[PDB]
């Protein structure tokens, strides 16, 4: 190893630029079925690595974990490595009442509701998606057709608080979340996740390239629970378009 | 009138739910060179507006002036007309040495160093451009052909502290300022304009649809002049108004 | 020429270090008819400007329009030619109802709701009027036999928004300001314009001198919105005052 | 005994809708010597109160102490008795050269370094002396014969880290007010104190008329140190113009 | 002679490295006479310093007076006399119903709404107290026998609108802090104080000791309001307390 | 299952309130190794929880991952099912040269340079430890004769910005976090971890109690780097602590 958090070396790059990083480590896998080849490198704490081949090309598969924090260490060293292009790929609730439970959305920039973008550009610079991996995704919904709409997405810290969740031991919220949910819902806001604005904000101001893809478990204002577990062959719908996104990069 | 700063009715928009908007009055005529049958409807104060068609249907082409506070008035107003898109075009100050004179520069997303863009929505929120809108930008300047480049812009709330400008009567910046231009070096931003951040910011948290692309009539890094006074923005901005139209 | 937006050069001033500065460029000329030998300068942009002469020394008047940031750019570029001693005559709303139509509005001091004004100090620094400039408005005031209010003043980034106008497009207002009018009502706060806190701000921070009038054309408490256009020659009241109380610093 | 800190009600005023109040417990009664029927009511902490007249009409006395804090419930208990003018008198340290030693200061608007002005006002809201109050200041200092600097000054919350004072016992300064210093004068900041912002934005915020004049002890540049003991005669120089300002104020 | 404000010499305290830091100049020495050899040193402004022998060695006892402002200077100026632990006692107002009048509260950290503490240390920075000087305020708030709680406390700068006191002259209280004391009560804080997070904040990045105890005259959700002797006698009962809080420390 | 990311029940507790919440799912392991009757409960995500019985008590130990947002979640879903003491255990980058190599660090209260704690309570609340969670913890240092510091501890969002690390890709780090050790080089903070202000933060306001304890596996300030590789003793030897301390507060 090189590297102290990821525990890879220079060589287990195998000549990749890219990597894609999805937050749950056991969906890591998923993506690596679709891929040439697939080589795992290592699984320590939240972060689960894997190597593959796309149109035979290399491309690292590496998990992020939970929140911002887990995020910035891992696409930090990666693009030690290094990486220049980012994939995130989020399970989301989404906030949004015309929007239905299981669609794929495209963010363009976050909302930095987290603390971890602060780390790396001030609150004014705007937690940003790449044009380029932007692109890709409709892109890669282009050929698909998975529902996909265009807009703003929450990026919180918190599970609970933030996200405005109220079925919880204190079942309070501090002043800036009090009505937060609507307050995101006439803004046009479609979504609740916890990993964006730290990597956009992360990327945009290093000079690194980042798109972000998500697929909805429930819809926040609706109130039945989500078809489980019949409905996560929609979750690997919205893993073949982050995989097909990789292609069109090359 | 219908509002108070514009001078615009009903009729003068025919159904137009698209509008240009450049910063000077004078450039707007200019503007509707490329577009079909120019008439003027009201240039009241700083807006100057003239209606035209574009394939057959109705199109607004209106200043904003300069400055956020002024350019939130022209797109609250137009929109209260019944306008979702706004296109902005004007010039900028280039940061990056591959960047030249004579290079468009489009906006993913602008830092806002503005205050008018938080009387829209808070800091946390970005100021981002429609994708739908950004697409057609980048596709119309490859469209044109023209040596293009996408990223991030800053939005100063002033000329010159916030752009960091010494030639001043002072000749001293805020702390904040004071050495952020550099800092702005790696943080990747390419150009520096005045109108975006409260454009995007106002588009983006009321359902709006907006753009932005810039040419470049000087780069910070650069100490030259311009050459001179005849030495692309416009003809993309019909171009681009064209795809969502 | 020596400047960039207004387009002007010294020699224009004819060693003029006072100058006026409106927002509608229309009017510029109307108050240089209160000044004697009116030569016009340029009409670059917004940036009006005027060329005149008052008790044998040269007075200049140039335009800013609406908004700080087109103030800053006037008021820093007339500055280097250059005015020390800047006076503002504007077009405002009260909050207050005591303040009716036809009144003329001198301001102390100004509330920074906006953002240019942080570009010259932080949000510590007061935008205070210098006295110089404020005694001249109140002695001129006083003697025309014409309405005067002295105070605090409101100076908002947006129109619509920040003023606390719900009359519009989405039919919301932002957290910050959704109940804003309600405190600056309780505090005294006099009228509601969009460029007294930058102007003061940059010119009591720089070293300058900086004065404020507007005359009122609209009461925001009060149902009307007055009838468009008749009596506001009190721009008259609002034009005589500035020019009487201009004259005394040349 | 309605006033809880003060120790003190109107009965003692007695009949007054002014008050004087410097921040020195002790020096209250050398200010109450310039005044007819002086008449010592109540020292308690901070607060040291006399009860005199000047011209007629009666004025209040009563020390505020060191702080925001201590000004602050001075200003709610007294107005609640109430005064509608308040007048600080003070000592300060000048941070300008091109000030001398022994000269006096009159206070239009103070940067708020201060914590307890926001329990008032906004950050936004301007700290800005009334301007009646401010141009007899002006007029007394004109009419003493004193030399008189009006402008702004900075009012810290503390006398050593505040007002960029490295003689720390630890010998250092936050983030915040690293370098504070010599950014204020060239904003044009003429001294430092401690109170005003407090007494100038509640005032203000709360619908009161306050002038602010204090006497300067000491330059920050100048390494020339107030000669002992009797240089501070500079404060009794400065108490002529508080009660002369007082004499026009009423 | 030898600090500006306290006007004390380092001998003056005998080598004393330890002092009890009340708020009421003239209740300073009623906690001094409990100690051997009570000995007045010096009364300036709101500063009464006394100098006890504590199981005969040199302790001291300062007052701090109104607001961190004030209590800043105290303690930075005692701190060039070599003392290093400062142990202040107070009168109180709980938020919690659970506490009633005679329980008395230790404070561990307090909720800085002061604006003192700023100057040391940024919003960041918590203002804790030593754990070696916490563990002995109840040490022997229990050894007397009081009954006693252990917690948060928050510091505003003023008193009454800070503390969102409502029965005031203009009877509002600011945006910011409208309903601040149910925030607070549901949060888990225990009291309202003045002076602790300055205090607290500085000796934690100063390096110093800090210990913060005070008996409990009024609680807030409470409709009551202090009672004498009641409230008195439990002063002597907290006096006793950090007395012999300051044995254990020395 | 009742939780969501956790997947725990109840029942798993067998009524346990007591956890040890180090980040790390692995060593988890380790810390029920030394307890009695050693059972794994649940091992999802980055939480892997255990059941443990002390003193004959039932105790638990669950991972919580890195950062605050992970942090967040398991302190929640675990103090629901319900948990009500925090003992969080982890290791950590010396920031004071005479903290040494294998010393045990007892955290008081922390510097929240992280984001979720703001989603519990305002940046004005303090991240303070409960004092019983912190007694038992320091008196378990005391218990065992292992080197300990008792302190403040900084909290960042991200590993390699908030730290002052220079070696990423850019290599630059946003102005905020400029020479920001040192300040705390100076202000006295002891070390560097990811976790602690949340939870501080999340118990108090909640509230709960909650202790931090941790390890020096790094010095970065002085000359010595860490061994390879397991040197890191204390991550052993401190779990040995917080166990003592796990069996003293039931
Ligand atoms: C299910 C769900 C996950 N998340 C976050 C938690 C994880 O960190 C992240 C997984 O990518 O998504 C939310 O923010 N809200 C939700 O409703
Ligand atoms: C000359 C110049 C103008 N501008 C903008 C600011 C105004 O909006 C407008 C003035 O011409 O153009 C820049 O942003 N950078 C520059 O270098
Ligand atoms: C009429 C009116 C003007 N204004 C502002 C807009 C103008 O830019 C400013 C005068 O320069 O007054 C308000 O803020 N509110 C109002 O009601
Ligand atoms: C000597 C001096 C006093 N002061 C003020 C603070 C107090 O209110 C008073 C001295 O106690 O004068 C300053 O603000 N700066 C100074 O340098
Ligand atoms: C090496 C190192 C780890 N850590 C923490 C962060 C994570 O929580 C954990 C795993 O690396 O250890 C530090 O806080 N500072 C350090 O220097
Ligand atoms: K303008």
Redesign the interface.
Known sequence: SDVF?LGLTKNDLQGAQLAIVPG??ERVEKIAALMDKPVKLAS???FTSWRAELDGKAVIVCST??????T??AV?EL??L?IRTFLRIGTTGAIQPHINVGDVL?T?????????????????????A???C??AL?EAAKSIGATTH?G?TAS???????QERYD???G?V????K?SME?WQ???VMNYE?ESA?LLTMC?????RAGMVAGVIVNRTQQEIPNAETMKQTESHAVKIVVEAARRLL
């Not at 974990?65 to 887990?70: K, Q, R, Y």
């Not at 602060?118 to 004014?124: C, D, G, Q, S, V």
């Not at 945009?204 to 690194?208: E, H, R, V, Y």
């Open positions: 958090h749950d480590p320590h704490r939240e974990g939970i929140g911002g924090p887990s910035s260490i930090e693009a030690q290094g495209v363009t920039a976050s909302v930095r509701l987290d603390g971890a973008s602060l780390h790396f550009a001030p609150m004014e610079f705007p937690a940003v790449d044009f380029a932007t692109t409709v265009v703003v919180s810290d918190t599970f609970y608080p933030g919880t031991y204190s309070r501090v002043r800036r979340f009505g307050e006439a803004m046009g916890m730290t945009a101001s290093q000079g690194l």
